[PDB]
Amino acid sequence: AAPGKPTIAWGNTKFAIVEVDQAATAYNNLVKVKNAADVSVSWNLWNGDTGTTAKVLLNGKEAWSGPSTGSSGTANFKVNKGGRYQMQVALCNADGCTASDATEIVVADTDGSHLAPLKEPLLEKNKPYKQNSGKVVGSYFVEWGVYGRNFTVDKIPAQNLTHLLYGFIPICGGNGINDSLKEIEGSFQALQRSCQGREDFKVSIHDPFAALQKAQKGVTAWDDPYKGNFGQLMALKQAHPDLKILPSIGGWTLSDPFFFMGDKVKRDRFVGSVKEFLQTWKFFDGVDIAWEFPGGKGANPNLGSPQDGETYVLLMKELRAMLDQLSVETGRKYELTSAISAGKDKIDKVAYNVAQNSMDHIFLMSYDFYGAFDLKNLGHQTALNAPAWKPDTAYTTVNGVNALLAQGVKPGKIVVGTAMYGRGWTGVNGYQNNIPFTGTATGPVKGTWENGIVDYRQIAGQFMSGEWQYTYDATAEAPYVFKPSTGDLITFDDARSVQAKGKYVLDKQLGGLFSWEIDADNGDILNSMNASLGNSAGVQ
Ligand SMILES: CC(=O)N[C@@H]1[C@@H](O)[C@H](O[C@@H]2O[C@H](CO)[C@@H](O[C@@H]3O[C@H](CO)[C@@H](O[C@@H]4O[C@H](CO)[C@@H](O[C@@H]5O[C@H](CO)[C@@H](O[C@@H]6O[C@H](CO)[C@@H](O[C@@H]7O[C@H](CO)[C@@H](O[C@@H]8O[C@H](CO)[C@@H](O)[C@H](O)[C@H]8NC(C)=O)[C@H](O)[C@H]7NC(C)=O)[C@H](O)[C@H]6NC(C)=O)[C@H](O)[C@H]5NC(C)=O)[C@H](O)[C@H]4NC(C)=O)[C@H](O)[C@H]3NC(C)=O)[C@H](O)[C@H]2NC(C)=O)[C@@H](CO)O[C@H]1O
Q1: What is the extent of the structural domain holding 123?
Q2: What is the CATH number of the domain that holds 533?
Q3: Pocket residues: Cβ below 6 A from ligand 1
Q4: What is the DSSP letter of 505?
């Protein structure tokens, strides 16, 4: 007679291809990429002949087999593809095979193949759009936004984007390499702990707790291997297979290492570490380089060189070559992007007409034109055009596009920036003809999180009532609110100025729109980005 029917032993059923060490703070120790997950199953036979061969099946297919030598057994074997499997133990002899009931086992991998799709409802004022214009609609999500700002990946309005960028992935290095981080309390020290035992100029994760271990919706169980932002982004990729999720390296405080990459020893180590990072974290679809800025004038006053332009072009070419090789290894398309200054003084330190051949998209940071960093020379921080009172204004969106076009950059590469925050001043005074921007200020406006900066959500919620004046400058294409009694002045984007940027993109055949930063919108800005580029209301 055939063997008795085995009972699968109670035991762990959750396994991982990329293992996470739950008591490690250094990135070298935190993650271990294997070629396959080690899986184990045990069984008991409560009734009958134990058979002569025992097998473990996954969806009917043998993953292990061995002699059946008593009433209990254990099998250890490797599984090299992520997902959920129906696992059975079968005992066989010459008269037949008798299979257990199925038990599901979960084999985790960093493409999110083990996770349910994170498909959450739109919140606040977000309305559903189809991505059918063919234009970029992008936004940055910040790693540290999950604490005070309480803005997690399940709150992103992800159906209304083509591109979701993750700010920011740091480059390892201590004194003289990341000195700009020492302005943020505990930040420099945090990176040195993550990078312990790791070479400088390799990428790492700045806050491993936020990125991988904080409990979040959909990834709360203790033995879910990937939690935090990266676990939720994997499940978001399962819900939105065509969303491009790009890691962004750099930003204001993590850009110092790029200024050493004229040494090709360092540049090659960096590029190899990006390759390894994308092999490790398979939910990401390329890399965004946010080097602020070639030539200097970023956070560190002691960096910047005439060599930086050449280094930027080399870096992009070598990044592209690495991503092209990864792309043919995997069958996937990988993207290379960069966030760049929109000021013409910074643009013309780089030959973007050459670098564009390596790049899918240029994110033109057409914002921060003005703000509480200068208390004397006030203006619209993100306007399309100059205002009527100063038609020679240098920093406008159109001037940054035109600088790129004059180099020979193709228009379709250029993605225009929108701000989901305002900048502003207090104590504005000495202005003519009721235009507050012709005066000077005494300090920054009171910000939501930091001095001088206000989330758009708070502008709309608090500063469009009471004593606040609202004006839409139709020459500049820019809104501003002004409180005359204290001289508080805030310059920002709204649905109408975004609509003007979107029409301008369509008119000039540019590549689309992107925004900083997704947590600060209430929905009005991203709704207008989508509508103004011609995306149809609704869902697919
Ligand atoms: C055109 C022209 O030429 N004009 C010129 C201008 O361009 C130029 O100005 C520059 O212009 C650039 C563009 O051209 C622009 O850059 C780009 O644009 C973006 C916007 O401008 C810019 O944005 C910057 O980005 C920087 C980073 O690079 C941001 O910096 C961040 O700031 C945050 C403060 O708000 C920091 O935060 C803190 O983060 C720490 C983490 O490290 C966090 O700590 C956690 O705290 C919690 C406590 O609550 C702890 O949690 C507790 O504990 C448990 C767990 O332990 C928790 O689970 C629990 O919940 C919690 N409970 C409690 C109660 O206890 C947790 O443990 C803590 N810490 C850890 C990790 O251990 C703090 O909470 C955070 N605080 C807050 C308030 O959030 C953050 O760290 C910091 N990030 C980094 C990486 O540094 C800026 O905010 C941001 N600004 C804006 C406007 O948003 C981008 O960088 C650029 N983008 C791209 C795409 O490239 C330049 O920024 C701009 N610079 C200037 C000066 O403006 C000017 C000037 O030269 O010149 C003109 O000419």
Answers
A1: 108-419+496-538
A2: 3.20.20.80
A3: 140, 144, 147-149, 168, 184, 187, 190, 207, 209, 214, 251-254, 290, 292, 339, 341-343, 365, 368-369, 373, 395, 421, 449-450, 453, 516-517
A4: H
